[PDB]
Amino acid sequence: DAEKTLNHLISGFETFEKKINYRFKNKAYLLQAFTHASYHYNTITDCYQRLEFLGDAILDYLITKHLYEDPRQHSPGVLTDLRSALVNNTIFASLAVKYDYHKYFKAVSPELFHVIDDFVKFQLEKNEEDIEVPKAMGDIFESLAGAIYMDSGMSLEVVWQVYYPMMQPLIEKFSANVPRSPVRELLEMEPETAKFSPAERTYDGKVRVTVEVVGKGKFKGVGRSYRIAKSAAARRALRSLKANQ
Amino acid sequence: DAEKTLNHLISGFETFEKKINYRFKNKAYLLQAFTHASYHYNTITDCYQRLEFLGDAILDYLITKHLYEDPRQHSPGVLTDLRSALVNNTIFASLAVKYDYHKYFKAVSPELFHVIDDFVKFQLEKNEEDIEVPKAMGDIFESLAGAIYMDSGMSLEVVWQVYYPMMQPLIEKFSANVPRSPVRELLEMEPETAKFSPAERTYDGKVRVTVEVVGKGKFKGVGRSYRIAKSAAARRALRSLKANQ
């Protein structure tokens, strides 16, 4: 009887649904999300791989959107680096164990569980390199997102309602530590006092811009685009401001 | 006067908005999407890089969603391959030129435009290897998606309304040509006549499944998961069906 088998296999997930603050309408999707290929006791649903595939693109979008909207106004290169750093199996594995996913993971592999235990312990200590990252932990962080998406009738909004609280602190930490965009940094410091002049074309086919910072003087930047020129000029102004005479 | 400069730079985009069947509320976003780093005449908006970043994740999600929902029920490995094949700068560049994006692209690079012309010509002939792919064409296929998203008030639905007609035929072509999932293929052929038995555990810690195809006999599959076992059994049944005695 499939429902009796479901009831057996989902025993203990109550605690997990409370922890993430989401109640599954269809528990089969939650079981599927946590079912590794090796979990032969699950004779009623697919393993997590399809959900992982969907969840990967869902998280890529929600994380990308967040990065793009960040009022730090990261440059394209910084956005790219941040996306690579965050949309990432290791980062996903770290967040999975932070939020106890390993306590609900379904697999038959003593060796995998040993790797998981060591990784959980390391991450706990780290958060109060020769630790192997259990890729399945990253996998189920993704597959659960896919499961919530499916269970909620394909709602990205419901997914992010659940995932944002888990992700935002790490996203914010990474976003706060990457190099600042020199334009936004200057304007944080001198919002009405830093003024960029119109772009001018150079003999060598570049763009030159001057930023004047009232009380500090004028600083020139050149680059292969207006964006790069502004950045260059701001970086110079910032250096003078920091030097403080 | 910024609006006079906008009016000048967007001259000719009328034809493009008609072609994609989307009217921008804010033309600045359309200009930005098509503005390469080298286009120094654009002194009023950013270049396309930020939009490209956002658009990349938007298309990754919409394409992934489509692949996942395809009633061909691709296996995880096939889904992965298809995503890699489709969410791809070369594929994006080919679709951009198919839909005339190169006629509206803003750049200052005779050499780039030469590469573009050769690529347009090749693709036209192909669609009635030693052709360089102009990466900027893939870039603006992505940045325009980001621009439509922004202009429509962050609507994925409006993006896909515009993009689906451009993408679905290529997605469908790739999806139709990849290896079929043997389970779905068998069930297309024998929907009421192919029946999978319950999973059984093997001495070596695998799963074994038999599929019985009425009129043809029984075929066994073994694998490291229930999913793989079913696939294996179906592949055998298919081979017999095709042989047709």
Side-chain angles (χ1 to χ4, degrees):
Chain A
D1 183 283
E3 213 67 15
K4 298 181 192 317
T5 304
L6 181 60
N7 288 339
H8 178 48
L9 295 175
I10 69 171
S11 292
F13 277 89
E14 298 90 340
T15 310
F16 187 61
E17 292 187 297
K18 303 276 260 288
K19 170 143 201 134
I20 60 166
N21 194 34
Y22 179 77
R23 182 188 82 74
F24 275 78
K25 297 180 169 181
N26 180 343
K27 312 298 187 191
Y29 298 151
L30 176 58
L31 175 61
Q32 184 185 337
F34 279 82
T35 292
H36 183 76
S38 69
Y39 193 66
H40 62 253
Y41 299 102
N42 185 342
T43 51
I44 52 164
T45 80
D46 201 11
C47 55
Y48 68 56
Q49 293 187 69
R50 282 188 72 259
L51 289 170
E52 177 197 339
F53 173 82
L54 181 61
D56 186 73
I58 286 170
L59 294 179
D60 180 39
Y61 165 71
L62 294 168
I63 291 164
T64 293
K65 176 177 181 293
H66 183 98
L67 292 173
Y68 180 88
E69 296 178 340
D70 183 339
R72 277 176 275 246
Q73 280 285 163
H74 305 291
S75 69
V78 175
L79 287 172
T80 297
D81 289 345
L82 279 170
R83 188 152 77 186
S84 295
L86 290 160
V87 187
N88 178 291
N89 178 271
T90 297
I91 294 300
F92 293 162
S94 78
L95 290 177
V97 300
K98 189 177 184 300
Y99 293 98
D100 282 357
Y101 286 45
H102 51 289
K103 298 186 182 187
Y104 310 96
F105 179 55
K106 306 298 178 250
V108 178
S109 173
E111 293 178 45
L112 177 53
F113 274 105
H114 194 159
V115 173
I116 296 173
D117 295 341
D118 287 354
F119 181 71
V120 169
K121 177 181 187 290
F122 173 69
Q123 289 293 129
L124 273 177
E125 288 157 1
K126 173 177 167 167
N127 291 291
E128 286 156 1
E129 174 280 341
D130 293 319
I131 288 276
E132 176 179 354
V133 178
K135 295 185 193 87
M137 291 304 92
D139 293 356
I140 65 176
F141 196 66
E142 300 189 307
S143 60
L144 184 75
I148 294 176
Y149 175 88
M150 177 159 296
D151 191 63
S152 64
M154 303 175 296
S155 183
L156 292 174
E157 294 70 33
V158 169
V159 176
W160 200 226
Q161 281 178 178
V162 179
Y163 267 66
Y164 171 92
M166 290 187 284
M167 296 219 66
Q168 184 273 347
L170 190 51
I171 294 170
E172 173 59 15
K173 179 184 184 309
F174 278 42
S175 296
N177 290 318
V178 289
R180 310 289 329 278
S181 146
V183 174
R184 203 66 39 206
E185 184 181 356
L186 178 61
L187 291 174
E188 281 178 8
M189 299 272 286
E190 299 290 325
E192 59 286 324
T193 44
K195 302 209 163 331
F196 294 81
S197 68
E200 81 191 27
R201 147 272 184 193
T202 71
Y203 288 123
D204 54 350
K206 306 302 173 36
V207 177
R208 180 174 55 235
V209 178
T210 301
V211 67
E212 184 156 29
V213 172
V214 178
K216 278 267 169 211
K218 294 170 180 55
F219 306 87
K220 300 196 138 198
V222 177
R224 73 162 159 293
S225 71
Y226 199 171
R227 166 172 275 283
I228 294 163
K230 289 196 222 169
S231 193
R235 191 176 301 116
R236 285 200 168 75
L238 280 173
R239 164 170 332 122
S240 173
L241 279 160
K242 253 45 71 197
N244 200 18
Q245 286 213 190
Chain B
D1 183 283
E3 213 67 15
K4 298 181 192 317
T5 304
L6 181 60
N7 288 339
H8 178 48
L9 295 175
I10 69 171
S11 292
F13 277 89
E14 298 90 340
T15 310
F16 187 61
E17 292 187 297
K18 303 276 260 288
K19 170 143 201 134
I20 60 166
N21 194 34
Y22 179 77
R23 182 188 82 74
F24 275 78
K25 297 180 169 181
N26 180 343
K27 312 298 187 191
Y29 298 151
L30 176 58
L31 175 61
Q32 184 185 337
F34 279 82
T35 292
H36 183 76
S38 69
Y39 193 66
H40 62 253
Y41 299 102
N42 185 342
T43 51
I44 52 164
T45 80
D46 201 11
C47 55
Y48 68 56
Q49 293 187 69
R50 282 188 72 259
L51 289 170
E52 177 197 339
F53 173 82
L54 181 61
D56 186 73
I58 286 170
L59 294 179
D60 180 39
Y61 165 71
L62 294 168
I63 291 164
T64 293
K65 176 177 181 293
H66 183 98
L67 292 173
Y68 180 88
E69 296 178 340
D70 183 339
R72 277 176 275 246
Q73 280 285 163
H74 305 291
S75 69
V78 175
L79 287 172
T80 297
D81 289 345
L82 279 170
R83 188 152 77 186
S84 295
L86 290 160
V87 187
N88 178 291
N89 178 271
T90 297
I91 294 300
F92 293 162
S94 78
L95 290 177
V97 300
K98 189 177 184 300
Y99 293 98
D100 282 357
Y101 286 45
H102 51 289
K103 298 186 182 187
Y104 310 96
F105 179 55
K106 306 298 178 250
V108 178
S109 173
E111 293 178 45
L112 177 53
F113 274 105
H114 194 159
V115 173
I116 296 173
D117 295 341
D118 287 354
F119 181 71
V120 169
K121 177 181 187 290
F122 173 69
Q123 289 293 129
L124 273 177
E125 288 157 1
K126 173 177 167 167
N127 291 291
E128 286 156 1
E129 174 280 341
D130 293 319
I131 288 276
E132 176 179 354
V133 178
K135 295 185 193 87
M137 291 304 92
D139 293 356
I140 65 176
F141 196 66
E142 300 189 307
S143 60
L144 184 75
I148 294 176
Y149 175 88
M150 177 159 296
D151 191 63
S152 64
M154 303 175 296
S155 183
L156 292 174
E157 294 70 33
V158 169
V159 176
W160 200 226
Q161 281 178 178
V162 179
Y163 267 66
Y164 171 92
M166 290 187 284
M167 296 219 66
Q168 184 273 347
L170 190 51
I171 294 170
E172 173 59 15
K173 179 184 184 309
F174 278 42
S175 296
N177 290 318
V178 289
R180 310 289 329 278
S181 146
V183 174
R184 203 66 39 206
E185 184 181 356
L186 178 61
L187 291 174
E188 281 178 8
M189 299 272 286
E190 299 290 325
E192 59 286 324
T193 44
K195 302 209 163 331
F196 294 81
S197 68
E200 81 191 27
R201 147 272 184 193
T202 71
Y203 288 123
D204 54 350
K206 306 302 173 36
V207 177
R208 180 174 55 235
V209 178
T210 301
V211 67
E212 184 156 29
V213 172
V214 178
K216 278 267 169 211
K218 294 170 180 55
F219 306 87
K220 300 196 138 198
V222 177
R224 73 162 159 293
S225 71
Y226 199 171
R227 166 172 275 283
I228 294 163
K230 289 196 222 169
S231 193
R235 191 176 301 116
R236 285 200 168 75
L238 280 173
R239 164 170 332 122
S240 173
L241 279 160
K242 253 45 71 197
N244 200 18
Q245 286 213 190

